[PDB]
Design a protein around this ligand. Structure first.
Ligand SMILES: [Ca+2]
Ligand SMILES: [Ca+2]
Lengths: 329, 329
């Protein structure tokens, strides 16, 4: 069960329901104690802000705010700023940067992954089953009743369901999206050529497990829609969404090439030292000041990005100075 | 003296004249023995092909052909293919790949640099002064008579001068370009934000020597014009043109960042070995099978790109297997 939000209105519920929805307002992703059901647990709420990015009316996540108890966090411009600043309470968040994901972990079995541009993945602990309300749908392992609204009623309509979870009572109702490729036909050739890597031999192993037709359509639509500068991001996010979805099953796929969605993992290296590499599967467990050499805490689901390969001398990372230190004070 | 052609119709003559010209035909860059003046020297000719890349009618170099004596070379899709295949004659070209440039060198003091996408730089030996005709202008160190046409007449008109050097007698006459930013106003904000790095503190040292106003305008126009997928290339080429122009004076400037025009120099590295780094200034001289350790042959003008840093063991490169070998057979 993973609530996946990425690109322009690509939502995948916990139970495995996929749909599309676009709008310009504030939306609650996961809400606790919906309907005032205070089951002796702290109420946690995650909200997102949508702004127009393009010319055909597509949407994308710009800022994400988290309301954990009395705290309040802000996520924008690739950085985190504390806003609520709760008093006389211990900070529950354990903000950490791994790969190309700004992982934020809680103490109630809630984990968030942020690619710092548009994508976001949510995983929830099994004991919260059947007690969660929000845009992610009720966690009940049933794909037919995930369309429950705030009124605790499942409605087959998608636009109404999406608009029912808005926060600001002044933003207008959302509308149905258009066809990005019809809007930008001249981009179709390049879009298809670039997104054809999904159907290529690279994802042959994944073809047997998951069906990439939906992700292929998502890539094509995303490439078609992205008109302003930054189409490279609009394509890399679309590919990385399917990459993470495949990695969730437990299979490692290498797809990055210096011609398509390149990475620069050598910039952080100081002069004369080379200790950063690209790991498509993602390091299962590493060594840092917080996590000792013996401890691993392999709670990840498989990520990717630049990771520091510490030398045999000082093989313990620091994560504060982006360098490897023998002894952590 | 450097004939610089890059982006969309950005030509800089040997004597230091800058202008713009666009068209869809075959054009001769540098021609020898113009007018049949056979000065007991082999005739060498370099031609280029222009195809539309966009929607507003902008041009760009797709394929470049070289006619050196009886030989004929083709440059397309980031590779070189011999076409003429001259018989009973020694091959004069010494094709070599350094940095992000596919350097092709001749035996008559002519050197070509190719970024493999659109840009091309030409340098000519001083003894050919006053005996060269072509789109690069007559090599005479005078910036007022560089507009000489095939009829050996200097005309202040630019469109007529550009159209007079066409090869195919069937292609239509070239037309005046439009304003890319007026054509694509919604791209103006992103274009200016991205090209503002020219006026930033990074090029403060270069600001004292060369005036980047022309290059700033070129970057803005290039970003505005580029509409189909691949605007990242359309911006990286524009920035790298000014970078190379600055490096020609003899000053090294570092500008690549993992957020703007990134590079992937770790892909070529095999597993367990790290020997590739990014050198903004460019290696002055290296060691390979052709060029021994003692010999350097520092005939470069300052380039940039991924270069192999051989380990102390086997510190001699090979350039054939992209690896360092102790002894070259
Ligand atoms: Ca359900
Ligand atoms: Ca002249």
């Amino acid at each position: 069960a993973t609530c996946a939000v990425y690109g322009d209105g690509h939502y995948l519920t916990f139970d495995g329901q996929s749909y599309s929805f676009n709008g310009d307002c504030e939306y609650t992703l996961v809400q606790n104690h919906c309907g005032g059901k205070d089951s002796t647990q702290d109420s946690f709420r995650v909200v997102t802000e949508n702004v127009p990015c393009g010319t055909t009316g597509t949407t994308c996540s710009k800022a994400i705010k988290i309301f954990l108890g009395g705290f309040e966090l802000k996520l924008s411009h690739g950085k985190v700023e504390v806003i609520g600043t709760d008093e006389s309470q211990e900070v529950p968040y354990t903000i950490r940067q791994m790969g190309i994901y700004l992982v934020v972990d809680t103490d109630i079995g809630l984990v968030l992954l942020w690619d710092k541009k548009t994508s976001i993945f949510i995983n929830l602990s099994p004991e919260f089953k059947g007690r969660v309300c929000g845009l992610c749908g009720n966690f009940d392992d049933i794909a037919v009743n995930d369309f429950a609204t705030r009124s605790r009623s499942v409605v087959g309509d998608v636009l109404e369901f999406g608009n029912s979870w808005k926060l600001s009572p002044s933003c207008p109702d959302a509308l149905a999206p258009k066809d990005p490729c019809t809007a930008n036909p001249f981009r179709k050739s390049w879009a298809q050529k670039q997104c054809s890597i999904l159907h290529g031999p690279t994802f042959a192993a994944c073809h047997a497990h998951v069906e990439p037709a939906r992700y292929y359509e998502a890539c094509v639509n995303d490439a078609c829609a992205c008109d302003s500068g930054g189409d490279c991001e609009c394509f890399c996010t679309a590919v990385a969404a399917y990459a993470q979805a495949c990695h969730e099953v437990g299979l490692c796929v290498s797809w990055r090439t210096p011609s398509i969605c390149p990475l620069f993992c050598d910039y952080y290296n100081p002069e004369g030292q080379c200790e950063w590499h690209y790991q498509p599967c993602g390091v299962p467990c590493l060594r840092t000041c917080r996590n000792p050499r013996g401890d691993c805490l392999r709670d990840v689901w498989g990520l990717e990005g630049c990771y520091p390969k510490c030398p045999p001398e000082a093989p313990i990372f620091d994560e504060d100075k982006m360098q490897c230190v023998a002894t952590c004070p």
